[PDB]
Design an enzyme around this catalytic site. Structure first.
Site, PDB file in Angstrom:
ATOM      1  N   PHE B 131       0.845  -1.186   0.000  1.00 16.19           N
ATOM      2  CA  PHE B 131       0.000   0.000   0.000  1.00 16.19           C
ATOM      3  C   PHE B 131       0.889   1.248   0.000  1.00 16.19           C
ATOM      4  O   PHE B 131       2.116   1.162   0.095  1.00 16.19           O
ATOM      5  CB  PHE B 131      -0.970  -0.019   1.184  1.00 16.19           C
ATOM      6  CG  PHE B 131      -2.242   0.755   0.938  1.00 16.19           C
ATOM      7  CD1 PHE B 131      -2.932   0.616  -0.258  1.00 16.19           C
ATOM      8  CD2 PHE B 131      -2.756   1.607   1.903  1.00 16.19           C
ATOM      9  CE1 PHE B 131      -4.106   1.329  -0.494  1.00 16.19           C
ATOM     10  CE2 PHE B 131      -3.922   2.329   1.671  1.00 16.19           C
ATOM     11  CZ  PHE B 131      -4.600   2.186   0.473  1.00 16.19           C
ATOM     12  N   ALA B 224      -2.591  -4.882   8.980  1.00 14.73           N
ATOM     13  CA  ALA B 224      -3.669  -3.932   9.255  1.00 14.73           C
ATOM     14  C   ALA B 224      -5.029  -4.620   9.323  1.00 14.73           C
ATOM     15  O   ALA B 224      -5.793  -4.428  10.277  1.00 14.73           O
ATOM     16  CB  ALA B 224      -3.681  -2.836   8.190  1.00 14.73           C
ATOM     17  N   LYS B 265      -7.114  -0.293  12.101  1.00 16.50           N
ATOM     18  CA  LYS B 265      -8.023  -1.038  11.243  1.00 16.50           C
ATOM     19  C   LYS B 265      -8.710  -2.108  12.075  1.00 16.50           C
ATOM     20  O   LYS B 265      -9.648  -1.791  12.833  1.00 16.50           O
ATOM     21  CB  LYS B 265      -7.269  -1.626  10.043  1.00 16.50           C
ATOM     22  CG  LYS B 265      -7.014  -0.666   8.889  1.00 16.50           C
ATOM     23  CD  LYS B 265      -6.125   0.486   9.292  1.00 16.50           C
ATOM     24  CE  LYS B 265      -5.474   1.116   8.092  1.00 16.50           C
ATOM     25  NZ  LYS B 265      -4.572   2.201   8.537  1.00 16.50           N
TER      26      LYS B 265
HETATM   27  C1  LIG Z   1      -2.151  -2.336   4.262  1.00 15.61           C
HETATM   28  C2  LIG Z   1      -1.747  -1.076   4.981  1.00 15.61           C
HETATM   29  C3  LIG Z   1      -2.642  -0.021   5.026  1.00 15.61           C
HETATM   30  O1  LIG Z   1      -3.857  -0.141   4.425  1.00 15.61           O
HETATM   31  C4  LIG Z   1      -2.269   1.165   5.700  1.00 15.61           C
HETATM   32  C5  LIG Z   1      -3.176   2.323   5.778  1.00 15.61           C
HETATM   33  N1  LIG Z   1      -4.258   2.363   5.029  1.00 15.61           N
HETATM   34  C6  LIG Z   1      -5.129   3.386   5.042  1.00 15.61           C
HETATM   35  C7  LIG Z   1      -4.792   4.703   5.707  1.00 15.61           C
HETATM   36  C8  LIG Z   1      -4.246   5.753   4.724  1.00 15.61           C
HETATM   37  O2  LIG Z   1      -3.908   6.934   5.449  1.00 15.61           O
HETATM   38  C9  LIG Z   1      -3.007   5.263   4.012  1.00 15.61           C
HETATM   39  O3  LIG Z   1      -1.980   4.889   4.536  1.00 15.61           O
HETATM   40  N2  LIG Z   1      -3.252   5.337   2.692  1.00 15.61           N
HETATM   41  C10 LIG Z   1      -4.535   5.817   2.415  1.00 15.61           C
HETATM   42  C11 LIG Z   1      -5.182   6.036   1.195  1.00 15.61           C
HETATM   43  C12 LIG Z   1      -6.473   6.526   1.177  1.00 15.61           C
HETATM   44  C13 LIG Z   1      -7.136   6.802   2.362  1.00 15.61           C
HETATM   45  C14 LIG Z   1      -6.499   6.585   3.576  1.00 15.61           C
HETATM   46  C15 LIG Z   1      -5.209   6.093   3.604  1.00 15.61           C
HETATM   47  C16 LIG Z   1      -6.329   3.260   4.358  1.00 15.61           C
HETATM   48  O4  LIG Z   1      -7.424   3.923   4.789  1.00 15.61           O
HETATM   49  O5  LIG Z   1      -6.417   2.563   3.357  1.00 15.61           O
HETATM   50  C17 LIG Z   1      -0.993   1.203   6.293  1.00 15.61           C
HETATM   51  C18 LIG Z   1      -0.528   2.442   7.023  1.00 15.61           C
HETATM   52  O6  LIG Z   1      -1.131   2.478   8.320  1.00 15.61           O
HETATM   53  P1  LIG Z   1      -1.406   3.836   9.135  1.00 15.61           P
HETATM   54  O7  LIG Z   1      -2.521   4.703   8.367  1.00 15.61           O
HETATM   55  O8  LIG Z   1      -1.904   3.452  10.612  1.00 15.61           O
HETATM   56  O9  LIG Z   1      -0.150   4.622   9.214  1.00 15.61           O
HETATM   57  C19 LIG Z   1      -0.166   0.101   6.193  1.00 15.61           C
HETATM   58  N3  LIG Z   1      -0.555  -0.988   5.553  1.00 15.61           N
END
Ligand SMILES: CC1=C(O)/C(=C\N=C(/C[C@@]2(O)C(=O)Nc3ccccc32)C(=O)O)C(COP(=O)(O)O)=CN1
Ligand SMILES: CC1=C(O)/C(=C\N=C(/C[C@@]2(O)C(=O)Nc3ccccc32)C(=O)O)C(COP(=O)(O)O)=CN1
Ligand SMILES: CC1=C(O)/C(=C\N=C(/C[C@@]2(O)C(=O)Nc3ccccc32)C(=O)O)C(COP(=O)(O)O)=CN1
Ligand SMILES: CC1=C(O)/C(=C\N=C(/C[C@@]2(O)C(=O)Nc3ccccc32)C(=O)O)C(COP(=O)(O)O)=CN1
Ligand SMILES: [K+]
Ligand SMILES: [K+]
Ligand SMILES: [K+]
Ligand SMILES: [K+]
Lengths: 466, 466, 466, 466
Positions: B131, B224, B265
């Protein structure tokens, strides 16, 4: 020693206990003679730090309950931005999860900004004193951390109003030696934690900013304990005898360009940090681009919305003069009780802690064998009080040399959390240390069993020299 | 479309409102046509992320209230250590303030460790899909982020049990092309967020670990959404049909050497992250050494004690099959309503979000003009519902070549927070997107007005192509 | 049946659980065939009452933790006083711990006031319908509780706008039969709980107050569910179509001299009651003198400061039309689900519950054998849903005759707590009662094993008739 | 004077402020010279009561967050029933909303139970000293409240171990004069609030109960401050030198048949009461039947479920000897400060308050003019501290004759809330009173401007006699 009454009453409590003598000696040996590696259940009165251990108000817990946990555009981000405009007159904010996250956002950005015109070929940061994580981030990015606090701070028993002052002559000489193009930023730490939580006058802050503006140098205010610094200005500067604390703070930040704040200190929080930038949008935009990978999105910066909400309320409560008078008065009480028993401390006491001069308590232990840590393990095994070392141990090694950084002060720090302990807790602390007066010359010294290469005092395991 | 009743009842509510049409349009103009820069007061139902927006239990809030805020040795740290030994069978933990903080602890440590003998001169990470913050930390450290998700993920409407699987052929080919000495780690993402929250099967994870073990490659589980993966394994793998969720988790983590987890998550939190290591104490020690300057002391890692307390409780609740059945069932309900009305989505739905395939929704917009952000901005101005794009915008650019990373999928993500919205909220979302079916072909893409060099889609402002 | 979306989202959850059939049959036998004696752990969805089981907002919880716990003069007491002057235009308030505490303060004082003047030789209270604790307090003080609800409330399947209305003809007839000197007070119950939570029209309230003021008769507005009554007046009276909920309430209380409120209903609380007097300072002073021995000091009256704090906030939230539309619409949705399957209910449904007409559902069981209780114990044994009886069981015996009070309605009340359950919970409830269609004609009455002389239905143990 | 340190630390604070002398004088004049009618915003340190003003622990708040709000069969109700079986060995509980709610449940039931078979024609209650609300309920039911505290309580300066003891000779005299058939119950108040919070010895409780059982008289333990009584028994009775507090409590309650408890005192609560019955199921059943119209259903009794959860946790914390030692040591510290400066107090100090003997302090004021209320009003105007009168004013008038009840004591009660004020607050209170020495003889008494007939001192308005 004068006791000051709390300008509040208690609303919620948590139990503490005294571990037995046998529990403490077993636990300290298992912890490799480093109290950082002790569990909290082995500690009675915890004086390790005033960072993140403060007792919040009922208003702060209410702010947390209605805090907006939205990922983007939280209502409390806009509140925090308004509060920073009110207190400092700064126009830009970036929350961070705590103080070393704030520095990790801003310091790499300032270094790249200084390199835009091929400058910063031999980069340095100049401070009255970089505390350990501040110097660690300065060094992590390939720069030198220079400390030029007034020499008065090295004379514990000799009172001075502003033992946290920059040495103005050393500032101009460092600017001359390194060149303005090599000084990435000047960091004014208020109060100066390493000097003993000792304050920086408004004139010293004003002259440092003028000299830095004369040479086009960026100034960052390390604002972990800015309210306690502001309180000392109103107490000791005749110009501000009739000003409010918010007026003192508002004049302080006319003499910086940005701030990194650990909100775990004067804003009375358990977690939280803050970057704020006066009016430089380009540095703000660059800092935002680094906040995202390191801390989080730019409107929460690694904090839950409830914690920004608590920060907005804590930034207000931390400036109240009647609370500041009690808090710093309490630290002064513990200091006067120790002085009255002839125990040497950094005089006058600072805002957040009493620093016992262990150079004078245990001169048979050379600084390289951490005399202050000897008194600490002694105090803990005697009483269950856990304190921290601010001397050669914390100072670590020179990243370029590999040898011990020269220590001008060997302090044991009795750090006091805000609104947590009473003066009766202080009496236990003072009486506990006083009782070891016939045992200081018996104290030994320490040698490494495992030593980390960076910020070694947090997790190094020590072996008594006996 | 099958509604599944909550395995809980509501204990505390938070008000939400529908802003007017003219308020949303002015807001999106103000936010540079990037929903990320919107204030939450301009959002009705917020589908921007399932990260940190979850609703906690009364047991979680109770855990916060008795949380131990001690700087070192917090009771809640040892609870978390025990909890990770119970769930994953892992011997070492390091708390982090959230997921990207946990990656910043471990990924640079793994890079340095791999280069200890002069190897890994061309370092890379291999994952089914990194990601964005994960790939950003890989690239900030000077490595390449290689993604090798199964080709079946690129066929939206064709059902498959495991659209998050590694491409085992591409895994072996990449170990051959790059060499095991250049592969710092293989990262197994569960669920595979980029593929649409799609699960990785146990036998896929098992084969990746055995392939990696043959070549001595360290495996990290990006965890996550690991409980949502465990649920799918139980639903679809006949080997785990009669097993508990925790028995599935215990098996999953036999096929990794460590994990980085965003606790915002599946652990049902508003903040928090976690590093766990199986049994490599040397990696654990080096990761501790990096945690102190970047995050905090090793027993809180940038979290308040109350947040570690909530995490211990959240880790238990997140494994509850009754909640998991309802949660994933709510996501399935939203997707079924859209799929029944002819709206293309990644089928089957993932655990945390419905992923609308906008390439087949708006074929007139090229991938480099971000077709899904057009649909998102269209949905927001229509209903006050804010979504997030997972396509060319979020992919960014290849840092070496500087050009758009080729996107095989152009998703609009309707991300559903855990235990926050009812199925009647789901009906509001579905009807809104269904009401835009006659206006899809009229939408156009957006170009850049301000683009950050890294993680652009968070703060970038867009210009709608007229 | 029409589902209405929540005007809020979930901020905190509480786990619920379905007990096995064995657990339910054992528990109901242990409970003397009275579900009131069942433990909460043996219950799935609890529909026993809407009193005190509501879910508060984050603002209410935030008000509680800054609540002022002072014994006398709490800051929240004055907030509560101002709130009642804003909402009802009443100039005096007395807090009470809940509704029956408020009646115990005011009703004995009303009797002594009428007697001080030589009247009330044969005292009576007159209401549209006294609920059970209301009727019990009137009887505890030696008065008769007369109920003159419109006979249209007895025709359950026939629609009527105001099935809670007084019978103006019976009101005038009772005034002449007893004399104004014997009528201690008239109690207007809004909504009329005994009639099925059915509303009283504004003009009916206006006519009753004018008739009473003619005769010098004190009017008390029983106000547990006054906001739901205000909603029905806006929904059904053309004069108030464009009025706000607060404008409707403000007019309602022009037609009373005082109120006794159970705040555990519409003000969305788990505990709390209120007395508020319009302008009669004499009744106020007398009521204060009774509050002290029975409830507490006059500025908290048996409530913690935090609960008075939650009442000020809940009073405002209870008036919000968008919330009232969803809450009352959820009750109607459950009704329409049952109606569409041919289950007879009090039509239209009231504001807080659906009343299943067990006189039309199990006619083989005579009212003296509590047919509604038969349906309830059957519904509980089948699904874990706990309901309550509103008929001859709740009506009890007449104090004068010692025989069964004549019941015109046999109701099983499916009472819905506010902001607690979703429409999916409603579906489970409706599906459970629908699943019993074939077993209604076989249900059996119940016989007393132990019968309290006052409010028997709360603690009585029953025997199934063989 | 010996300061005892807190066996806890502060976790949450509430702000307090000192009103200006201008505000205080206006506030007292507005309050009819009755500090009860003062708003808390005009009070600095509030010593009006120790009832419901205590500070809960984080565990108690955590118990509130997970409290079960179910109307019937709350999980916390059963925990409470178990806790009373554990502590008191009593088989039956009925929760009540506070102390006088418990008395309203049990005292009428005891009277009717005693009046079976046509006896108890001239009913009386006997106690060492009925407190004001307790005696009010005795008299509201048409009984006499006979108080027979030991004569040693009337000599303030002369030490005694058990100044709350029953006068055994007077108990025997009153059993003979009235007859065993007319004595509804003997009430054992522990500690004896009116005697100065003075304890009752275990042998005194034993001989009272044995005498009562010889005559078949029921014994109710008024238990508001039963833990403070249990501490004094262990501190002063050599037989219990090595006993646990729970062993002392278990023994105390072998000498009663039931208890009425205000949990707003030693259980460390802000609201809550309790009735507990040893093994008389008939009294239990009769008391339940009254609990329903007066307090609420039997499994909550006018309490939220959270408050019953806090009670279960407070009943444990309030028995902790290390907390009791600090709590009573703090009251003793305030007493010694006053005693060392020549201020006459009831010596030794009791559990919860310092009682100042105003019969010696202001001899010029006769008891009819309330000498203590003149000292209280003077202290409030001097310092902002609000205290309460325990003398002729609170005593009231005799129900049979209508004249002032003879007062052996004229106490100003400095009432200390539990875990709320530090010893530096005790210092402020002390110096404030000591500074009024040259003004005591100048004070004059009060006269009634408005007098209630029942519990007059709460809401009476007084006029200073000039
Ligand atoms: C598999 C994995 C994740 O999906 C992941 C976070 N995902 C998120 C949070 C996030 O801000 C993002 O990072 N990108 C993104 C893109 C659009 C909206 C929101 C976001 C998510 O909503 O999809 C992390 C990082 O964790 P963290 O936020 O606690 O630092 C690590 N590994
Ligand atoms: C002036 C300044 C600080 O004093 C400061 C924090 N100081 C601390 C907390 C700390 O962990 C530390 O950093 N070193 C250290 C040494 C001994 C004990 C505890 C600690 C303190 O206890 O004095 C920071 C970092 O902020 P942060 O903790 O929120 O990341 C930046 N600037
Ligand atoms: C109109 C009015 C009320 O409806 C009312 C209370 N109603 C209740 C609560 C109650 O316990 C009850 O009293 N009877 C009853 C019967 C079955 C289940 C539950 C209950 C209710 O569920 O309908 C009160 C008393 O207020 P209170 O409970 O705060 O003391 C006064 N007036
Ligand atoms: C021994 C005993 C009690 O001391 C007792 C309560 N005492 C209180 C509270 C009180 O309002 C009161 O009643 N009188 C009084 C007089 C002056 C100030 C405040 C008060 C107290 O501060 O001394 C109760 C009643 O319990 P309750 O308050 O929960 O209803 C029963 N028994
Ligand atoms: K902390
Ligand atoms: K969040
Ligand atoms: K309740
Ligand atoms: K209170």
């Amino acid at each position: 020693a004068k006791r000051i009454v709390e300008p509040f009453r208690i609303k919620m409590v948590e139990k503490i206990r005294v571990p037995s003598r046998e529990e403490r000696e077993a636990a300290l040996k298992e912890a490799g003679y480093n109290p950082f590696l002790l569990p909290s259940s082995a500690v009675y009165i915890d004086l390790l730090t005033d960072s993140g251990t403060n007792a919040m108000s009922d208003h702060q817990w209410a702010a947390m309950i209605t805090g907006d946990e939205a990922y983007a555009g939280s209502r409390n981000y806009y509140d925090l931005k308004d509060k920073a405009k009110e207190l400092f007159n700064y126009d830009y904010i970036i929350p961070a999860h705590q103080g070393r996250g704030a520095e990790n956002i801003l310091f790499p950005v300032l270094l790249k900004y200084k390199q835009k015109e091929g400058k910063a070929k031999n980069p340095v940061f100049i401070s009255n004193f970089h505390f350990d994580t501040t110097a660690a981030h300065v060094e992590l990015n390939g720069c030198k951390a220079i400390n030029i606090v007034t020499e008065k701070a090295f004379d514990s028993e000799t009172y001075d109003d502003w033992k946290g002052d920059f040495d103005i002559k050393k500032l101009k000489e460092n600017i001359a030696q390194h060149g303005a193009d090599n000084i990435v930023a000047i960091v004014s730490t208020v109060t100066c934690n390493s000097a003993g939580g000792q304050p920086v006058s408004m004139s010293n802050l004003k002259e440092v900013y003028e000299i830095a503006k004369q040479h086009g140098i960026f100034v960052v205010m390390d604002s972990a304990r800015f309210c306690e610094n502001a309180y000392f200005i109103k107490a000791r500067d005749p110009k501000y005898k009739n000003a409010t604390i918010k007026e003192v703070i508002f004049d302080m930040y006319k003499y910086a360009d940005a701030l990194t704040m650990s909100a775990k200190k004067d804003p009375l929080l358990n977690i939280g940090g803050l970057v704020a930038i006066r009016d430089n949008e380009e540095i703000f935009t660059l800092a935002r681009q680094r906040c995202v990978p390191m801390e989080g999105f730019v409107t929460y910066g690694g904090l839950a919305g409830r914690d920004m909400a608590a920060m907005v309320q804590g930034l207000e409560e931390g400036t109240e003069e009647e609370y500041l008078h009690y808090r710093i008065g309490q630290v002064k009480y513990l200091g006067d009780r120790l002085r009255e028993a002839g125990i040497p401390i950094q005089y006058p006491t600072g805002g957040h802690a009493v620093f016992v001069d262990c150079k004078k308590l245990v001169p048979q232990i050379p600084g390289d064998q951490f005399p202050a840590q000897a008194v600490i393990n002694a105090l803990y095994l005697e009483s269950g009080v856990r304190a921290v070392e601010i001397g050669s141990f914390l100072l670590g090694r020179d990243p370029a040399t590999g040898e011990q950084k020269h220590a001008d002060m060997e302090f044991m720090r009795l750090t006091i959390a805000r609104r947590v302990y009473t003066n009766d807790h202080m009496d236990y602390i003072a009486d506990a240390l006083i009782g070891l007066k016939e045992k200081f010359a018996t104290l030994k010294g320490l040698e490494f069993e495992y030593e980390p290469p960076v910020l070694r005092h947090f997790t190094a395991r020590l072996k008594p020299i006996e």
